[PDB]
C-alpha cells in the first residue's frame, strides 16, 4: 500500500508521455500517527 | 494508433475555440469538426493550459506549502474569505495547535499518510474543514473542502450511511444472475439511490475511441438520453488519461466564477492532483447548453495495463456538492462494477469462441453451405452473405452484376487472400454508390481463383435510434456522429476476421 | 446465559420500551456506573442515535454506532441486531478520543480499503496468485504473525493452500485436516455475520445475567461471544493466542468457499477502521473468486472438448486411441487408465495386472450387471480384493463400451500428493485425515463423468 502519484502529459521530443512529480506494517503507522500524547 | 492522433485534433479544436472566444464569436461546432499536422508548441501550450490552468472551483480554497519551514508559495483569491495570509507565511499559524500538529505529521509521513485527509479547524473561526494533501514538483497541495458543523457522531454516522448503502449495492451486484446490460442497468440504479442526482447515465466507448449511452435512470420530468452516440473529440484525450488518476471528477456549479490562483517559481502551477480543478470554458458551454448545472463523473476501469472502457456520469438540474465520504463509496462501487465487468467480458469471448467452433464444425460437416440451416452467416455476425462459385445470394447482398464487378475491382486491385473494409467507399470501389447503404461493409475471404465467400454489413445508423448544429449540444453530436459514418459500417473485429480465415483454410 | 469475551460489554433491551432485559457482568464496571431505560446510561446525542438506530427497518445499515457514557464521557463503537424478542447491543471501548481522529479514521477505513483492493484490479486464471496477494495484502493490513487461506473441499474438509508468516514460524501450506475440525453450526454461521475474532484465548469468559425470561436469549450473532472449550485448547496447543477469521463467500443461493484465518503469539486487538478495511477487501476477494470460479470450468470445458475431439479423430482411425501422445489419461486428472478391447489389455501409467483387471471384470458382470460404477474407494465398493492393489489402484471409474470392452481410469490413494512435513494439534488433525482417507482417491468430480460419458456416447 502507498500513496498516489500523479503524472502530467507533457509533449517531449516527437512524443507525448507521462512525466512524474517502507518497513512498518500499516497497524504500526496507524498506531505511530493517531496518537493523543501532544494533548496533555 | 487513433487514440494518439487526436491529440492533434483536440489541439486544433482547443484553438478554434479560444480564437473565436477572442473575437467575441459564437463556436460552430458543425464547421469545427468538419474542417478539424502541429507545431510542438501549439501540443505543448494545449496540454499547459489544461493541466496548469490557473483557476479553481470557488466551493473551496487551495494553499501550496513548502515543505521546508511550511511556506506559503501560492493560493486562491477566495482562501482569505473562507479562511475567515500573504505569499511567505506559516501555513501552521492559520489553524489550531491541534490542527498545525495533525498537519505537521501528515507532511512527515513517506510513501503512505494515515492523516490524510485531516479534520482540521480554523484560528479565527473554528470552522471545520477537510483538508486533502498531495504532492507537486515544488510542494505539496493542501485543498480545504468545508465541513458542516454538527456534532462529530453526526459526521461518522453519514459516512457510516455511505459506507454500507455501497456494502448493499456490491452485494446486489454479486448476487445477480449470469448479461452486461443487466448489471449496467443495476449499477445505475444503485448509484443514483447512492448519490441523489437527478441524471445517471452510463457511456461506452468503442473501438473508435467515441462515445455511447447504454443505460440511464433519470426523474420522469427530464428527456431521455440512452441509446445516443456521439463523436470521439467531445471527451479530448488529455481528460481521459487524467481519468485514470483522479477516477472521481466533480464538477458543482458551471456558472459559477473562477477563482484565480496566485503564486520564485518559473512555471505555473500543476492542477491535475486537484479536485478543485476548475473545468474548461467549452465544457462549461456544453454543459449551460444541455442545461446541467453540476455533475459527477466515475471511471470504469478494467484490466485490459488498464484501459477505460467506459464512464459513469451524474447530473443535476442545479448546484450540488455532495461530501468526501461519498466520493469514496462512489469510488468503491465502481471498482466493484469494473471487476465484475471485466470478468463478464472475459466469459462473453469464451462463449463467443464456443459458438464460432460449433458453428465451424456443423459447416465443415455439411453449396450446402449457405442452403442449410447453420449457414455462412451465422459464422460472423453480419447483415447478409454470399458464396461464389455461380453465385449464392443470402440476405441484404448486391445483385449478381454488382458483385460480378465488385470481384472485377478486387482482382484488378488487390489479386490477396482476404479483404475486410467498413467502407467500399473509403476503399475506393468505383460502384459504391449504386449500392446505397444497404452494402457498407464487405468481407472477402478467398478460395481460389474463382471462388469467393463474402459477408456483405449495412451502415452503423441502421441500428442506431434515438428521440431527436452550430451550438454545442447533445443533438448537434448526434447530428455530427451521423455525418461521420455515412457510407460506413461496423467495424470488422479481430474474432470475426480470425473466424472467417479459419473457414477458409478448412474450405481450401 | 451465555459468556463473552472480556474486552467488551452486552446490554440487551427491549425494543419498544428501550429496557434493560440482560447484559453482561463487566458491563456497569466499563461504564463508569435491571429492567430500567437503558437511554439513561449515555449522553443525549448518543440516546437519539439508539432510538434511530431500533426504528430502523435494517437494523445493520447503523451497526457501528459512535456513543459516549453518561457517567466518563468516553466512547464506545456499538453493534446492534435483534435477537428475537428484543435487540443487544456489544459496546467495545474506542482507543481514540478525539473526534478529529475519530473522523479521520472512519474515512480512510474506507481509503485503505479501495488502496488494496486496486491491487486486486492490478493482477491479469490464477487462483494461487490471488490468494497470495490477498494473504499478503491482509497480513499489511493487520501485522499479524500469520495469515492462510483455507480452501473447503466438496467433502467439506479443508486445505491451507495459502500462507504468509515470520521466519521464525513453521510452514503450514499444504496441511489437510478432517471436515469434523470446523463443526457444521459455525460454517452456517459464517453465512451469518462474516468475522469472527478472539483476542486471547487464555482469558476468563464473562457471564450475560439474564432478567422472569422466557427461553434464553441466542448469542450466536453476538461479535462478543466466548469460544468453545474445543477450540479454546485447540489454539493454545498451536501456539496461536489471537485469532480473526474471515469468511469467503461465493456465489451457490450463496455458499462457503473458504476462510482467511489469522494467527498471532499473544492476545491482539485490531482497531476497528482495519477490520472494516478487511472486510471490505473480503467483499472484493470473493467477488473476484467467484468469477475466477466461473471461468476456470469454461476453460475447462473447452479443453476437454478439444481433447474429446483428437481423440475422436483417432478412433475413427480402435485401439489407436490408447497408442498416441494424447490418450485417455488426458480427460480426467487421473493417475493411470486402462482399455480392454476384445480381451487385448492396454494399461497406461498405474494401472493392474491383466489377471487382476480380469477378476475385476468379472466382479462388475456379477455385482455390477449397467453402464458403469465410480468410487473413490475399490475396496469400499464391494470388491472382495483391493489388497493386491495396495495403494497404487484405489479409485476406479468405469465406462461399459460393449459385452467385453471397457475402458477404467485408476487414481490412487490421496496422500501420494498431499506433501506436508512434520492432543488437539495440527499433526494429529493431519494423521487423522490421512486415516481418513486411506486407500481412497479423490472424488471424480460430476464435470469429469460427464467427459467420460460424452466419450462413451459415441462409441
Ligand atoms: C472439537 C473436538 C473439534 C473441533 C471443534 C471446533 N472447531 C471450531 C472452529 C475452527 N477450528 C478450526 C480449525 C483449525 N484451525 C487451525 O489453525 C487449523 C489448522 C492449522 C485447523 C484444523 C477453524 C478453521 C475454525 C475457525 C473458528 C474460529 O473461531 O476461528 C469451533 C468453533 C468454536 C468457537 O468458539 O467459535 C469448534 C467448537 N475442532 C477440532 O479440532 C475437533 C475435531
Ligand atoms: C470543447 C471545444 C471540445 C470539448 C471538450 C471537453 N469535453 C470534456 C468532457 C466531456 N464531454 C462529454 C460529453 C458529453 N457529456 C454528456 O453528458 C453528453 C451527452 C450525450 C456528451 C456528449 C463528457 C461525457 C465529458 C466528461 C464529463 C466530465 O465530468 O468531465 C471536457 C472535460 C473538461 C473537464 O474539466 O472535465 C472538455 C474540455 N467538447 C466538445 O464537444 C468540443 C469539441
Known sequence: LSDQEYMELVFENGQILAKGQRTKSIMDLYEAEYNEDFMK | ?508
Request: proline share 4%; hydrophobic share 40%; with cysteine.
Open chain 2, 1 to 508: 494508433s487513433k487514440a494518439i492522433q487526436q491529440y492533434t485534433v483536440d489541439a486544433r479544436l482547443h484553438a478554434v475555440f479560444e480564437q473565436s472566444g477572442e473575437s467575441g464569436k459564437s463556436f460552430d461546432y458543425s464547421q469545427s469538426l468538419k474542417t478539424t499536422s502541429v507545431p510542438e508548441q501549439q501540443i505543448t501550450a494545449y496540454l499547459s493550459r489544461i493541466q496548469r490552468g490557473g483557476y479553481i472551483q470557488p466551493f473551496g480554497c487551495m494553499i501550496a506549502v513548502d515543505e521546508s519551514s511550511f511556506r506559503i508559495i501560492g493560493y486562491s483569491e477566495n482562501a482569505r474569505e473562507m479562511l475567515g495570509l500573504a505569499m511567505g507565511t506559516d501555513v501552521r499559524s492559520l489553524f489550531t495547535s491541534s490542527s498545525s500538529i495533525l498537519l505537521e505529521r501528515a507532511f512527515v509521513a513517506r510513501e503512505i499518510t494515515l492523516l490524510n485527509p485531516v479534520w482540521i479547524h480554523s484560528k479565527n473561526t473554528g470552522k471545520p474543514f477537510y483538508a486533502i494533501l498531495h504532492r507537486i514538483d515544488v510542494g505539496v497541495v493542501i485543498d480545504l473542502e468545508p465541513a458542516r458543523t454538527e456534532d462529530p457522531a453526526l459526521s461518522i454516522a453519514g459516512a457510516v450511511q455511505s459506507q454500507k448503502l455501497a456494502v448493499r449495492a456490491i452485494s446486489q451486484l454479486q448476487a445477480l444472475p449470469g448479461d452486461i446490460k443487466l448489471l449496467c442497468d443495476t449499477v445505475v440504479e444503485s448509484v443514483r439511490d447512492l448519490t441523489g442526482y437527478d441524471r445517471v447515465m452510463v457511456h461506452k466507448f468503442h473501438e473508435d475511441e467515441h462515445g455511447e449511452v447504454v443505460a440511464e435512470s433519470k426523474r420522469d420530468d427530464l428527456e431521455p438520453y440512452i441509446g445516443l452516440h456521439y463523436p470521439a473529440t467531445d471527451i479530448p484525450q488529455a481528460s481521459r488519461f487524467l481519468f485514470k488518476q483522479n477516477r472521481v471528477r466533480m464538477i458543482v456549479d458551471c456558472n459559477a466564477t473562477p477563482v484565480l490562483v496566485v503564486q520564485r517559481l518559473t512555471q505555473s502551477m500543476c492542477l491535475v492532483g486537484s479536485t478543485l480543478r476548475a473545468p474548461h470554458g467549452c465544457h462549461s458551454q456544453y454543459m449551460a447548453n444541455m442545461g446541467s448545472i453540476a455533475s459527477l463523473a466515475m471511471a470504469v476501469i478494467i484490466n485490459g495495463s488498464m484501459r477505460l472502457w467506459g464512464l459513469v456520469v451524474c447530473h443535476h438540474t442545479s448546484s450540488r456538492c455532495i461530501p468526501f465520504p461519498l466520493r469514496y463509496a462512489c469510488e468503491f462501487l465502481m471498482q466493484a462494477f469494473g471487476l465484475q465487468l471485466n470478468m463478464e467480458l472475459q466469459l462473453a469471448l469464451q462463449m463467443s469462441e464456443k459458438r464460432v467452433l460449433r458453428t465451424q464444425t456443423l459447416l465443415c460437416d455439411m453449396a450446402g453451405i449457405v442452403t442449410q440451416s447453420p449457414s455462412i452467416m451465422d459464422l460472423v455476425k453480419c447483415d447478409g452473405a454470399a458464396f461464389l462459385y455461380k453465385y449464392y445470394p443470402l440476405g441484404v447482398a448486391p445483385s449478381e452484376v454488382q458483385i460480378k464487378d465488385v470481384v472485377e475491382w478486387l482482382l484488378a486491385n488487390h489479386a490477396s487472400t482476404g479483404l475486410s473494409t467498413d467502407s467500399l467507399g473509403d476503399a475506393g470501389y468505383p460502384g459504391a454508390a449504386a449500392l446505397g447503404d444497404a452494402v457498407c461493409g464487405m468481407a472477402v475471404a478467398y478460395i481460389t481463383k474463382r471462388d469467393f465467400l463474402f459477408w456483405f454489413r449495412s451502415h452503423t445508423a441502421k441500428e442506431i435510434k434515438w428521440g431527436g448544429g452550430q451550438r454545442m449540444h447533445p443533438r448537434s453530436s448526434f447530428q455530427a456522429f451521423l455525418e461521420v459514418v455515412k457510407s460506413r459500417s461496423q467495424p470488422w473485429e479481430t474474432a470475426e476476421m480470425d473466424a472467417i480465415h479459419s473457414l477458409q483454410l478448412i474450405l481450401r
